[PDB]
Every structure is written in C-alpha cells, then in structure tokens.
Amino acid sequence: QEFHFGPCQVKGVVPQKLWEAFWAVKDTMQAQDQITSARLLQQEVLQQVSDAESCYLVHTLLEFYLKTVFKNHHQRTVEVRTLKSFSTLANNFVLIVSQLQPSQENEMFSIRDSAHRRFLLFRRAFKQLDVEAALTKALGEVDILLTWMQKFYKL
C-alpha cells in the first residue's frame, strides 16, 4: 500500500496520519478564512485527473504548498499547535515530492500541459485574493488536497 500517481510510486506516507495532523487544527484554520464565497482548489482543478496527469499535477501543487504556503505559514504563526501540525504535513509533503520522477520526454508534453492548465486555474484563483487572505485560505484547503491524493492510495 502506497500512492500510485500513474507510474510514480510513493511509500512511507500514511494517509490517516496526514488527517490526524490536519484535523488537530482544521477548525481554527477554517474559521479564520472569512471568505466563504471562494474556493481555490476548485472542482475544475481536480475532477477526473487522468492517471498520466496525476503525477505532474501533484508535483506542482505540493511544490507550491512547500515554497509558498507552508513557508509563509511557518514565518507568521503564533500558535504552536498549527506550527506542529503544518510541520507534519510539510515534512510528509517533502517525502512525497522526493519520490516523484515523472517522464521528461517529448511524447508527454500535452499531458504535462493539461496538468499545468489545472494548476494555473488554482494559481489564478489564489492571486485574485489579497495575499494574507489567500495564504489563510490555502492552509484551510489542505483537506481538499489530501482527499484528492488519497484516491491514488492503492495496491
């Protein structure tokens, strides 16, 4: 039992432990996002991603979470429990990303383009918000990301 994002296999990351970390802080993080009218990880981003797409999309989304979202969260939080819960998620996301070596050959170009398209729909939604508000929202939406990834946890 591993994640299988098309051909990339990811071991050592237990989905229920990712939940346990996020559920310690989910309420406080969701309560803080005062914008109920907008969702960044929208349906168009994650609905019926093909197996061959999935690896490129997951790489791009996680990197964005690592480089942008968690980094600025770490830099700003004043609650130790969210520092600990997001460390757990960011550390496991590091382990996922190290195991993603999707193909870089030309026959895959239009598949990576579809995956990048989905990512850019998320990115655009994120940049339409003020930056403090977009960070808060992206933190509180981690659950949407975990729920999608779990679909690929199989034999």
Partner: protein
C-alpha cells in the same frame, strides 16, 4: 442566544442541531463553499424544534458546505464550521446475518446503502464510496481468545467449533485511511447441537 450550531453525520445522513425564551423561533439557510448565495431550507423556517435534516442538500461528496441558523425571541445568527460529509460521517454497524451450524458460524455482511446518489443513477453504498473499505469479524471463544477474519468479501465462516456452544460475533466496517471504524454489529449465537453420527 445560540450555542453549539453543528452538523452530525451518520452514514452520510447529515443533521444540523443547535441549542442554548421558550417561544424562540429558528430559521435555517445553507450554502456551498465557493458559491455566493445562501438558500432557505424548505420545511425549516420559523421552527421551534432543534433539528434539521440537510441530507439532500449536503449530499455532493466533492463539495463542502456551510449552514446557518437565525434565531429571534417572541435576534442572533450563527453559522456552522465548514462541513465535509466524507470527513465528518460516522458509520453505523453493518447489517449482518449470522447463521449457526453445528461446527461453524457463517456470517453474511450486507452492503450498506447510503443517501448519496451517483450522477443520473442508483444510490451508492459505502462499498462504492470508500475503495479501501473492509470488514473485521471476531468470534470470541470460551472467554479466553478470538478468531479473526476479514477482507472485502461479504460471506465468511468460522470453522472448527464445538457443537452446542455459545459464541459472540462482532463485525465492524473499517475504512483505515479515513480513520473510520463503525459501531460493531453483534450476534450472540450457539452452534447447533450435534445429533448425527458424522463427527
């Protein structure tokens, strides 16, 4: 005023409840996270009851929802936490048929239907919804030890038992990746007495 406004979810039956005058009046609205418009739940405007069935209106599994209660004496408004049925739902015990035989006990796990319906079609079961779902079955023998069986299949049978003896079956649904485990179904049963000469 209004405290404890929240969802309870059992087998994706999603019930809003709240608590804190005696002639106080409650009105309910719901909404999808990411859409702008609040909708009025028909059947739940200006009620005295503390309960409201949103099973239909919060039944798309890819969405998250908000609901909101407005109260006023004979005013204040409170909204729920962001709600995901997948995350929040508890699982009822499975429906099981335990059949006693002379040297075994057979158990048939029935699929569990749900109020979730697949786009244009049939109501989905828990087995459809959670690909990682499985059953754990235990038979307590003497009172010392246990026989364990489990898997995705539905029919199970514990072999090697003594005729004419009391056992306790307990059967759970497990969805390990969501850290969900059902309430147990239980059957206390006796293997039939052995009246033939077959041993």
């Amino acid at each position: 005023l209004l405290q404890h406004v929240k969802f309870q979810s059992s087998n994706f039956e999603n019930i809003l409840t709240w608590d804190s005058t005696p002639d106080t009046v409650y009105s309910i609205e719901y909404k999808t996270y990411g859409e702008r418009d609040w909708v009025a739940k028909k059947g739940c405007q200006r009620i005295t009851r503390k309960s409201c069935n949103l099973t239909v209106e919060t039944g798309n599994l890819t969405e998250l929802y908000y609901a909101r209660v407005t109260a006023v004496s004979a005013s204040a408004t409170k909204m729920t936490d962001r709600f995901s049925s997948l995350q929040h739902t508890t699982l009822k015990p499975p429906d099981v048929t335990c059949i006693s035989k002379v040297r075994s006990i057979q158990m048939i796990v029935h699929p569990t239907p749900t109020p979730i319906r697949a786009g244009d079609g049939h109501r989905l079961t828990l087995e459809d919804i959670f690909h990682d779902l499985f059953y754990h079955l235990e038979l307590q023998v003497n009172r010392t030890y246990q026989m364990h069986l489990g898997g995705k299949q539905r029919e199970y049978e514990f072999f090697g038992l003594t005729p004419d003896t009391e056992f306790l079956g307990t059967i759970m649904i497990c969805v390990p990746t969501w850290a969900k485990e059902s309430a147990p179904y239980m059957c206390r049963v006796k293997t039939l007495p052995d009246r033939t000469w077959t041993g």
